[PDB]
Design a protein around this ligand. Structure first.
Ligand SMILES: Cc1cccc(-n2nc(C(C)(C)C)cc2NC(=O)Nc2cccc(Nc3ncnc4ccc(N)cc34)c2)c1
Ligand SMILES: CCCCCCCCO[C@@H]1O[C@H](CO)[C@@H](O)[C@H](O)[C@H]1O
Ligand SMILES: CCCCCCCCO[C@@H]1O[C@H](CO)[C@@H](O)[C@H](O)[C@H]1O
Length: 338
């Protein structure tokens, strides 16, 4: 029942895939992606060939982690795994991993650049991000790079969260605590990102268009206000505190005056996302129950992740141990229903 593989060279990369996958066409290059046609199903898929997956410890772990994660992501608003394969017949020759998903077209960036969004459109797009994030966050995973170009939006405005490689600067959507190199992060960093995206769908422009992380920080403080005493004290570096203290003391802007033409409920939600203290930001679960989404909110259809443990950053293993765990997951993979 092993499929028949065929070999092919594209952009100085060898691709060896099952014959069911035809018309491979490179769309991006750590892992490179081909648009392809699944002859079995008639569907357009993306095939990602991971770059040298077991050639560094960092790669081996990431490889295992992406596979184990995606094997368990089964949600309307999160990318799912259609297939996973390797040309290896044994663990001893296992050097390559390929992941297959539905092929995405436009991202959220294509939307906001192509049109001005009505409030209902903003509602549906943001609701779907939060529903997916609720699910991702429940598995104890942080996305860390939630931005419009990582958000696929199909022709009927169905949104999926994924990692789009480099197929819009990341720093525009980054919580301030990441750019301050805070060692430990809340999932709340992603909610900061949603606030930035939501603002941009309401106004049509990047909320905080920093040219670098210092500019980025200045722009942030201009809107939310410079931190108070207790926030300041959580910043352990005196030089960092001194630089922050040295900035002209910015008052907190009134979001209702800033976003003057927006739904007052969108503005209220915005205020709850873009709070400086990460402990005080609304959660995705809480956000979903916000009155802004009363049109789309259904507490019986906002599910959470299955019970598999996906908390792996803490885990230290040997390079060949990550490969063998990865091999087990490839072998035990069972393709989803239609
Ligand atoms: C540990 C780890 C490492 C790297 C990525 C992830 N990760 N995390 C996620 C979340 C569930 C947290 C959102 C998703 C990923 N990975 C992911 O999205 N992988 C993936 C797998 C197969 C294909 C693609 N990319 C394309 N797919 C579908 N059409 C395309 C159309 C054009 C292009 N250029 C790319 C594609 C992307 C996790
Ligand atoms: C968390 C600690 C934050 C402190 C970072 C302070 C770095 C900002 O100081 C720097 O000022 C330079 C002037 O010489 C400018 O080129 C830049 O705007 C800025 O990066
Ligand atoms: C330039 C000034 C920016 C202020 C940054 C404050 C960010 C506050 O968010 C902080 O996040 C940390 C990481 O999750 C948590 O440990 C802290 O308890 C929380 O207060």
């Amino acid at each position: 029942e092993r499929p028949t593989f065929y070999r092919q060279e594209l952009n100085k990369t060898i691709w060896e895939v099952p014959e069911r996958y035809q018309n491979l066409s490179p769309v991006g290059s750590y892992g490179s992606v081909c648009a392809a046609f699944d002859t079995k199903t008639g569907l357009r898929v993306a095939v990602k060939k991971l770059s040298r997956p077991f050639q560094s410890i960092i790669h081996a772990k990431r490889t295992y982690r992406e596979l184990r994660l995606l094997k368990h992501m089964k949600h309307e608003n999160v990318i799912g795994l259609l297939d996973v394969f390797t040309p290896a017949r044994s663990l001893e020759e296992f050097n390559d991993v390929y992941l297959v998903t539905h092929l995405m077209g436009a991202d959220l960036n294509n939307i906001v650049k192509s049109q001005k969004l009505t409030d209902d459109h903003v509602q549906f797009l943001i609701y779907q991000i939060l529903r997916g994030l609720k699910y991702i966050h429940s598995a104890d995973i942080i996305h860390r790079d939630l931005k419009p170009s990582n958000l696929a939006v199909n022709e009927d405005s169905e949104l999926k969260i994924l990692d789009f490689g480099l197929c819009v600067a990341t720093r525009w959507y980054r919580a301030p605590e990441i750019m301050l190199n805070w060692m430990h992060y809340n999932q709340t960093v992603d909610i900061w990102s949603v606030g930035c995206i939501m603002a941009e769908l309401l106004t049509g422009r990047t909320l905080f268009p920093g040219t670098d992380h210092i500019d980025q920080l200045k722009l942030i403080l201009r809107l939310v206000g410079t931190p108070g005493a207790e926030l300041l004290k959580k910043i352990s570096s005196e030089s960092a505190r001194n630089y922050i203290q040295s900035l002209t003391q910015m008052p907190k802007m009134n979001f209702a005056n800033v976003f003057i033409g927006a739904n007052p409920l969108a503005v209220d939600l915005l205020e709850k996302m873009l709070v400086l203290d990460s402990d005080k930001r609304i959660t995705a679960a809480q956000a979903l129950a916000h009155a802004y989404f009363a049109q789309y909110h259904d507490p019986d259809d906002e599910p959470v992740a299955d019970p598999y443990d996906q908390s792996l950053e803490s885990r230290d293993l040997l390079i060949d141990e990550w490969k063998s765990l990865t091999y087990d997951e490839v072998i035990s993979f069972v393709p989803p229903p239609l």
